[PDB]
Enzyme design. Structure first.
Site, PDB file in Angstrom:
ATOM      1  N   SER A  66       0.732  -1.206   0.056  1.00 41.73           N
ATOM      2  CA  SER A  66       0.047  -0.041  -0.003  1.00 41.73           C
ATOM      3  C   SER A  66       0.731   1.260   0.107  1.00 41.73           C
ATOM      4  CB  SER A  66      -0.960  -0.115   1.097  1.00 41.73           C
ATOM      5  OG  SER A  66      -1.628   1.316   1.225  1.00 41.73           O
ATOM      6  N   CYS A  67       0.065   2.326  -0.380  1.00 42.56           N
ATOM      7  CA  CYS A  67       0.807   3.727  -0.465  1.00 42.56           C
ATOM      8  C   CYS A  67       0.276   4.738   0.085  1.00 42.56           C
ATOM      9  CB  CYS A  67       0.332   3.854  -2.261  1.00 42.56           C
ATOM     10  SG  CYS A  67       0.451   2.561  -3.205  1.00 42.56           S
ATOM     11  N   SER A  68       1.068   5.900   0.139  1.00 40.14           N
ATOM     12  CA  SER A  68       0.680   6.919   0.968  1.00 40.14           C
ATOM     13  C   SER A  68      -0.694   7.548   0.763  1.00 40.14           C
ATOM     14  CB  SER A  68       1.801   8.100   0.713  1.00 40.14           C
ATOM     15  OG  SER A  68       1.524   8.642  -0.443  1.00 40.14           O
TER      16      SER A  68
END
Lengths: 241, 240, 248, 249, 246, 245
Positions: free
Chosen positions: A157-159
């Site tokens: 997952s990503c910011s």
């Protein structure tokens, strides 16, 4: 090359650095680097740092801190306030620019305090040794399998900034809103999900092969995401990405 | 909180016991304990025990008996007649207690009679993986380190939970429920319950699998009717 | 009877052969043979051979080569043209036999030219006619013995899913060509990339008959139109889904 | 009163009018008025008029033109530029009134040019009609919805528009300005969706977001079309194409 | 000009022929021709004929026969063996033409034996199949559009009105009594499960089912029953076209 | 026979009776009978009767009362206490017989007191104080809406009413409470878009029968139906894998 040749470049590159601090997120790449450094350089000559930010979940922070301890590294939590920069706080298109700019400046200063020669990140094909050793996505999975590494963040997952349109101002409230929605959706069995924020519209991205399975949850998700503040709760027909 | 520190705790604790009897279910946890026991104490000082029961599947029993021999342990099957006890046969809310007492009493008698210092199980009786603070992540890391890949992964529960409280368990209605769940698992639904309500079968599936299930409605209907149910139904509440 | 006696029979057979060529698929069985062969005879006395042909994926070949290198073996790919044999080119029901006669004769010729005493395959309890040894079969290895010894040797990585020849996608009597085989494999590869790792695209000229596990068919519907247009651009006129599901 | 007394009131009112222009939508009410008008005054003394505008679908216009001819009426299409009135273009709550106002004045001009004594609409038991002087003969004769269904069966009427066409303005939030472009965008999107087998559908306009409303019992059926709907509606100018999890309202 | 002038041409032409035989399918077009002829010439001078063939279902025939009786015509069925003509049995792309040739020849043979002046139909490789037969399409001569026929069907008070199985077969495939029964049984089974719009395309050992795409989700609960039923009708493989119907 | 001759048999048979009472349910068959009776004998000698009972819904009754007026009939409601008969109250396999006896005995008493020559129902092809004229004239299902379209008839109840008795096992005692439970459940299911549905009563289990072609569509409602039928008193809410009937 063979995997053994790429693995040898990595040990040789690491010995040449002698003392390193490694930016550790918990994905498969950073877990491979952190372990390779500990195996070639020893516990006391490698520093794992886990970034704590308003842009990532406390669970991803906690999971990386726990796998770094589980891997046997001295790991140090440092907390970054990405929202202090108004390029990031207003999520302008340069906003990745300053976020990476802040991440590495905290990481460069940490290396001075424990005497490391470079700080390492886990980028593939600051030093990114897996790219210098020409590791590809298949090579990283092969070496980790050989090194007996089994636990890592499968949830790449990503910011949480990627959920907001350019020009939208990030707030403690709308970030928590987006993250509570994604946490709820994941708790129903959708580990890969994005809840894109569009003011009153929530736009849900799911892998297309999961959309048929999602239908039994429409009404509960609709009512749950409305209670978090969205007026309309919708499904992107394009799917995830 | 390193894996190496917990593994030393487990080795050390196993060295303090010298001769152990291992409650062996065949899951990853009990298979990890059985290998650790063999590696530090040796074949002649470890007895693996596999319960043969009416409340768990013969497939679970056959797989565990073969996995203990495959790991290099002396393995013993013991057969428990849970239904001879009236607390279990009449499925009261306390039947789990009497079942656990019958099981641990048989395992204590085997361990006492072969000179073991304790009975071991896989909980995270001594649960040494729990005493050494093993989590699900720690257990997968150590099994990979010992080269263990093979174990049963179908999570096992007593078939008692398929019957209402007050129901008399019988050899036939147990066989009925288990043949039904085995059929459903063979269609691709590893998590499933066929709750027994006499002439009604009440199927529980994870809600996220119910859409996938519909292509099988008619075959499940006809198969569970041939197994003795008059009506075959799907709970709209899903599993749990 | 015990594993240790079965492991000793295998060690003794390998020591007696001194130099071997190993037919290596990448599965658990041939991985065990290659590991034992390397441990007992040393790297310079073992040749791992992986067959490359038009009847299997270039992915399958690349992964098998990588699995042999990871074990520490000197490995060489050999290329087989199965379609030169008319039993295979015309997909007769016995074509499997002529494919394996051709495979084992190439392995015998590789063995003759590097000085091996035998070719080893990984068969357990057309090779009788070429002289391949199955040392696990001679040593009475069953599937559980293979899993036991692989865990005692620290072997964890191998191919979990067996390869089937693309010949199985064509009806008996259909003529295989470099072109329609490329069609079947490109269609199956596209399907796997959508999230369906277990799939068959059966060839019936202008009709593609897709076999999926029935529990995935509900998930597949979001892809009907893209699969239709993609497989048509690969050369099929009609794109269909078998109602019986996978292997029926 | 009796259905027969109400039917006679309606017959009497039409003979006194001699020549009428009938506002024809294709619904049951205007279908009753038009049929009675033809039965009492004859084809040559009845003009059915069907409004065509960019706020309603071209498919509904053609269906009303065909229902009028199939009933035996001389039928005439008129075209209205509703966006010429800024009360309508600015999508206020009173915009419907100005749309009815513009419609009834065009009918008054048509009625003047063909020698009709009145414009008839199909209203049953309000101010735009009365300002213009349009007559609602079913209302004057005290027809209720059940009376309209009763007399309709007596005359053998079976075909009419069950769907009640709604103005495309409801796809836009109040205060959003209607344009030829964003209307054509919404109407082409709905037209594609209907052509896939979804007769009941809304494409709500949220600038770069299209928010699709479908009846919840049809959403399972829709799954085979997600990708084509996504690309079709993207080619029409939406950046994001979404499905409302709440369904139709 | 007006509808009244277009139906006026049709009145005059029907008055001039005095006795006609009418090719009756039951769709809106042929029912108007049959009703016009009865209203202008009377029951005793009009014969309606409905073709019965193996390429259509007995219900399509039964519905068409009643339609004409309800209109007031004396109705006659004739049965054609379309498969005797090898253009039709081998499903060439022109066989629709040869089927109409055999149909109009039988109707001309019927019309001569009851003495009609012409064969009438409801229309709006060689000579046109009617012209070669002598058949008149009076609605086409009067320049009827689909609206006029729908308009004229209401001015005469018409209320009740309404595909060859060859379209289930590829060109060049041989039609037989058996594989026709196979295809027809398969479609009847599918229709009986709730799919009124369906095609079972015959590809030898393969059945290719065409359904409207919006119904394929509803269909999955029936896959296994459809597979085993159509297999029992003689297909080895039973498949669903992902392109759907049409 | 031709449809036209079957219509003449019906016209002739109705003219010979002169004054009739019509058992009116609102389905296609009885509306065709009610319409033909009005078209041949005129309103003043046709009595439409609509039975109101605890085994059928108030919704079907109100719709039937209003459809009879729409057809041009004087309509009269009568009330039947089916549960007063113990074969019906105990849901014996006999209960259909006593329910039909009670229905036709009430209609005969209405017919005697308004001077009708017969009670008419809408039974077709494939009581003795009831004439089924469509059956005597050899009407089939095709004949009925062939003729119903010739009279322009459009409004009628398109899904078949069945007695709520079929939702309970034989031998189960019917009560106001368990009937209200089943009827609120089916009404809720219909309100979601499922006009053809059964909620079979098995005490603490509800067994929902839906047409198999709709079960895929129903999944979006699983949770809402689960919670609604539980609030009505069911412990478990289930979907029959065999579907409707």
């Amino acid at each position: 090359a063979t995997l053994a040749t790429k693995k040898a470049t990595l040990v040789a590159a690491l010995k040449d650095l002698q003392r390193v601090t490694v930016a550790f997120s918990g994905g498969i790449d950073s877990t491979l680097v952190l372990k390779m450094a500990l195996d070639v350089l020893g516990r006391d000559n490698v520093t794992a740092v886990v970034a704590n930010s308003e842009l990532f979940t406390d669970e991803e922070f906690d999971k990386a801190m726990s796998l770094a301890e589980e891997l046997g590294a001295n790991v140090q939590g440092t907390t970054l306030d990405y929202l202090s920069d108004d390029h990031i706080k207003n999520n302008t298109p340069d906003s990745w620019y300053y976020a990476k700019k802040m991440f590495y400046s905290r990481l460069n200063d940490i290396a001075a305090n424990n005497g490391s020669a470079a700080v390492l990140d886990g980028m593939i094909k600051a030093r990114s040794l897996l790219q210098e050793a020409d590791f590809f996505k298949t090579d990283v999975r092969a070496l980790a399998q050989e090194l007996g590494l089994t636990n890592w963040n499968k949830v790449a997952s990503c910011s949480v900034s990627s959920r907001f349109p350019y020009g939208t101002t990030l707030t403690h409230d709308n970030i928590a809103q987006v993250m509570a929605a994604e946490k709820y959706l994941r708790s129903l069995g959708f580990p890969t999900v994005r809840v894109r924020f569009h003011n009153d519209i929530a736009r849900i991205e799911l892998p297309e092969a999961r959309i048929g399975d999602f239908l039994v949850f429409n009404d509960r998700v609709n009512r749950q995401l409305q209670s978090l503040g969205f007026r309309y709760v919708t499904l992107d027909l394009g799917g995830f990405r």
